[PDB]
Design a binder for these strands. Structure first.
Lengths: 103, 317, 202, 174, 93
RNA sequence: UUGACAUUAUUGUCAGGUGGGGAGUAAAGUUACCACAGGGAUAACUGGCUUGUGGCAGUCAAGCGUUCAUAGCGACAUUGCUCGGCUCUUCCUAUCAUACCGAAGCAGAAUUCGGUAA
């Protein structure tokens, strides 16, 4: 069975699925840079995702990297007081990008 | 004028004032054009051809037939192959998985080049995180006697148990320890190897956490830790090797120079084998050092390596 | 996992013609709009081959392959091979010449037959002694004229149209192994005005 | 760390006698480096004799791995053979299978061995006997239980299995 | 091109430009689909609309870019004449 | 199994490490990591569907909040980066052309947008 939800896959993709025998994730549904806004200073910094941490609804989805509404993700601060984690707010299956708010 | 360049490092690179000041004093503007201008190269792609499974002359053919540009480094060993241009995956080639070669840096070679492992003897260890260097221990050995492997991290042992069995070393007692209480565990009479438990941590092209997040408190306790690890290394034996990946003095040639006085059983022999520049005497209001000439040095711009220091010791009684 | 279906009909031509691309160091690639000739010139020629592509379309560069992307018939692009390939002379010279087909077929074959002579004059200028010249050419009224000028400017001229072609298309891949490299070249010969001079009536 | 019982060695030697034949006598009798094997936390480790003799000082929590790991004892009481055994196994192989240079990476991702590779295999192979997969250079790739005999696998349609994949060296990417 | 440029397609003031391109995708494409159709026809419907609006804006933008004279490639008199009458940096911005 | 000491390789002591191997006071928890066989529970009904302007966070902010802006919701804007194809009949307009108009630096020609229009 294939997933029709937007996911993030880490850079060790080439032979990663030990426990994901036939869990097809197409390359079109892979969004790498979340459109993250900063709460304390109303500026939006379009930064790459590093790690998918805690997706509610499913603990399968945490191990697949699914980016449904409420997922806490890790944000790369290479471009740069800052908080390393952000919680997503949109449903990227419906709209274009992934929209997250820092914690 | 100095403060102009200190404004042209902490703003140009986005760098810490604490490190920019402590790595410019008694260093030339020419040397400032060597070290600081070399943190964009980011580790030239060398390789460590495992001598156990295959000789190098039988591995030059293997990658070239798949279209890999290869050329040996200067004088040291034919083992080190510089990769220039390859399209075949740089970790997923069947020969990686076989254990014919491990992907290393050029700085990963030399602390074990300086050490000379012989037949039937035991080698002890304290902090070898990936296990790339313990490969060079148990290949010159040709799988005889004992080889200890150690690091103080339960998460990082997975790289060791991956690389040892990957490259086929057979003689590895890979075990997690606290490195300080090590002579009380066993204390094997034959030689030991120590490398880089460091706060100075040279070449920022690898880790840019050094660029921003290094204060004085790291330089207080981590040089103290690696200082005590020497005091356990000299209580194991027998040719001690202690090295680090840092150009700052508070890591090498202040830590080794402590343990030189602290035991009369310590002799510093000619460390490296091929090339590597001469060591200093005065370290900004520091002691007399005519004995510390042989502990070699390497720069990121004089040669295409990553700046580090080696110190090889001998014990008598 | 190549770029186009034009990739599978030179790797097929090498096996039939003694793996000539295996031994070859430098290659001048013509008319390659996809990289279906430089990819297979990378997997056949030895490492650091230094192969040069010329095509009318401007498109991307490929790793390990230098490719200039401009005109074929001008003197300035001839000064871009003069810009590079003066010190080294090409071992082989490839030709995937193909027009934008769909106009009468009479002209769709004659602008091809015209294009191969201009590719020849870029080849006769920049080829090593006893090399080769592989060419896509349409079977037409003026094919027998091209095979003759090939016959008197090369050693052995052999036509193919290998398997893994369309089978319906009127393609020929003709190879011309062995190159004369004369000091006296006939100027009236190589020009297309005298080449397609039609045979008199019976 | 502990020494094996009488039955616990027999369970290991039978599984090793599935791939290596009766040439398991090469593995224990050497006299120079006799190569005894021990286990830590229910997982056997193959080493030189003295290198395990001096490592009896390491604590059980402090220990991680020891030389060459063969495989672990299952909770039910069987013996698995992990990929790390191959460096010891392929040097003393009995039934050996090669593959295509083209059909190498399918095997290296976890798929089985298809019939689409025809040449010179081993002979006298039983249907359900352990085979060892080689890839020019005779590079060992992994284990395998054979699908059919040598006779049956020659007159077959190229998309049928000849050797069921058990463990491959692609596990070194995890 | 040469001496003068009267022949330029007009420039919509970015609010009306939206009202041209978006209305054309509403009028020229099919607009009615049930939820009860096959998923393949639903996909192909909305794909056709995203792409058609894509070509819409691109067509209008290409008309502007090709229409206006390439200031530094025309002629030294005209390169400087347009630089005097209009802020050349802003004309290129 | 390592060090120290003595015998001055061999042997002793002490000290350091392991030690359900023996003496004394086995197997079990877990599982949405879950892979195969079995038992349950339904899936897949225009409840006028469908079309052109995204989403997330903030800035305003008509009012309503049980009084009411400091129990909270809040439209248009705005600011953040980014299975295909051959042939015919009839119908629809969401019209490409033909007909007539309106706006447009629309000198003329040519054109762009828009309206009526099948």
């Amino acid at each position: 069975r294939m997933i029709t939800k937007h996911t993030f896959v880490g850079e060790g993709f080439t032979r990663r699925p030990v426990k994901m025998e036939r869990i097809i994730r197409p390359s079109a549904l892979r969004q790498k840079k979340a459109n993250v806004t900063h709460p304390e200073l109303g500026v939006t910094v379009f930064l790459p995702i590093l790690a998918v941490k805690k997706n509610p609804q499913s603990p399968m989805y945490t191990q697949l990297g699914v980016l449904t509404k409420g997922t806490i993700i890790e944000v790369n601060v290479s471009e740069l007081v800052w908080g390393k984690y952000a919680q997503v707010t949109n449903e990227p299956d419906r709209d274009g990008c992934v929209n997250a708010v820092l914690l | 004028y100095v403060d102009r360049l200190l404004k042209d490092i902490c703003e140009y690179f986005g760098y810490t004032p604490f490190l920019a000041e402590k790595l410019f004093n008694l260093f030339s503007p020419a040397e400032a054009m060597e070290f600081f201008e070399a943190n964009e190269i980011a580790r030239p792609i060398t390789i460590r051809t495992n001598t156990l499974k295959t000789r190098r002359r039988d591995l030059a053919q293997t990658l070239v037939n798949r279209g890999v540009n290869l050329q040996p480094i200067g004088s040291w060993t034919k083992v080190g192959l510089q990769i220039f241009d390859s399209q075949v995956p740089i970790g997923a080639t069947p020969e990686y998985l076989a254990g014919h070669y491990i992907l290393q840096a050029a700085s990963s070679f030399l602390p074990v080049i300086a050490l000379d492992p012989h037949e039937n003897e035991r080698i002890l260890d304290m902090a070898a995180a990936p296990g790339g260097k313990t490969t060079y221990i148990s290949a010159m050995m040709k799988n005889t006697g004992c080889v200890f492997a150690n690091d103080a991290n339960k998460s990082r042992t997975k790289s060791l148990i991956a690389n040892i069995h990957r490259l086929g070393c057979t003689n590895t007692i890979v075990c997690n320890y606290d490195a300080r209480e090590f002579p009380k565990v066993i204390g094997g009479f034959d030689r030991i190897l120590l490398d880089a438990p460091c706060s100075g941590t040279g070449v920022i092209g690898k880790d840019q956490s050094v660029k921003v997040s290094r204060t004085e408190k790291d330089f207080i306790q981590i040089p103290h830790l690696q200082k005590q690890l020497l005091l356990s290394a000299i209580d194991s034996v027998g040719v001690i090797v202690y090295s680090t990946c840092s150009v700052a003095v508070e890591e090498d040639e202040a830590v080794i120079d402590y343990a030189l006085r602290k035991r009369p059983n310590v002799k510093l022999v000619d460390t490296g084998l091929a090339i590597g520049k001469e060591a200093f005497t005065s370290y900004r209001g520091k002691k007399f050092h005519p004995s510390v000439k042989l502990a070699r040095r390497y720069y990121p711009h004089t040669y295409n390596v990553d700046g580090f220091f080696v110190a090889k010791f001998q014990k008598i009684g | 996992g190549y770029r186009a279906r034009s990739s599978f009909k030179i790797i097929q031509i090498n096996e039939k013609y003694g793996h000539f691309l295996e031994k070859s160091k430098v290659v001048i690639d013509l008319c390659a709009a996809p990289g279906s000739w430089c990819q297979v010139a990378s997997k056949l020629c030895p490492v650091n081959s230094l192969i040069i592509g010329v095509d009318i379309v401007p498109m991307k560069p490929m790793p390990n392959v230098i490719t200039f992307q401009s005109d074929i018939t001008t003197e300035d692009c001839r000064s871009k091979l003069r810009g590079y390939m003066k010190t080294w002379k090409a071992d082989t010279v490839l030709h995937d010449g193909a027009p934008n087909v769909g106009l009468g077929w009479v002209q769709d074959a004659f602008t091809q037959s015209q294009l191969t002579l201009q590719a020849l004059k870029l080849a006769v200028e920049n080829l090593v002694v006893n090399g080769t010249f592989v060419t896509k050419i349409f079977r037409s009224k003026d094919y027998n004229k091209l095979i003759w000028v090939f016959q008197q400017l090369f050693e052995k001229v052999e036509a193919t149209k290998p398997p893994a072609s369309r089978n319906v298309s009127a393609e020929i891949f003709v190879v011309c192994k062995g190159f004369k490299a004369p000091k006296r070249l006939d100027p009236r010969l190589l020009d297309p005005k005298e080449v397609f001079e039609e045979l008199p009536d019976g | 760390m502990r020494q094996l019982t009488e039955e616990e060695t027999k369970v290991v030697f039978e599984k090793l006698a599935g791939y290596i034949g009766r040439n398991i006598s090469f593995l224990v009798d050497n006299k120079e480096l006799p190569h005894v094997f021990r286990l830590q936390k229910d997982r056997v480790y193959y080493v030189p004799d003295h290198v395990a003799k001096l490592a009896t000082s390491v604590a059980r929590p402090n220990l991680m791995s020891l030389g060459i790991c063969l495989g672990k004892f299952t909770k039910t009481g069987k013996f698995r053979l992990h990929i790390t055994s191959l460096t010891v196994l392929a040097k003393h192989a009995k039934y050996k299978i090669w593959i295509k240079p083209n059909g190498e990476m399918p095997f290296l991702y976890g798929n089985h061995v298809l019939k689409a590779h025809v040449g010179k295999m081993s002979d006298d192979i039983p249907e359900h006997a352990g085979v060892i997969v080689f890839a020019m250079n005779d590079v060992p790739l992994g284990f395998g239980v054979s699908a059919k005999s040598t006779s049956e696998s020659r007159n077959m349609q190229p998309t049928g299995i000849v050797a069921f994949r058990q463990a491959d060296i692609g596990e070194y990417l995890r | 091109m040469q001496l003068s440029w009267k022949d330029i397609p007009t420039v919509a003031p970015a609010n009306d430009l939206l009202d041209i391109v978006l209305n054309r995708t509403q009028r020229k494409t099919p607009t009615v689909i049930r939820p009860g159709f096959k998923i393949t026809r639903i996909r192909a419907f909305y794909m056709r609309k995203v792409k058609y609006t894509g070509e819409g804006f691109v067509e209008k933008f290409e008309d502007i870019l090709k229409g206006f004279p390439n200031i530094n490639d025309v002629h030294p008199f005209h390169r400087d004449l347009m630089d005097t009458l209009y802020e050349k940096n802003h004309y290129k911005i």
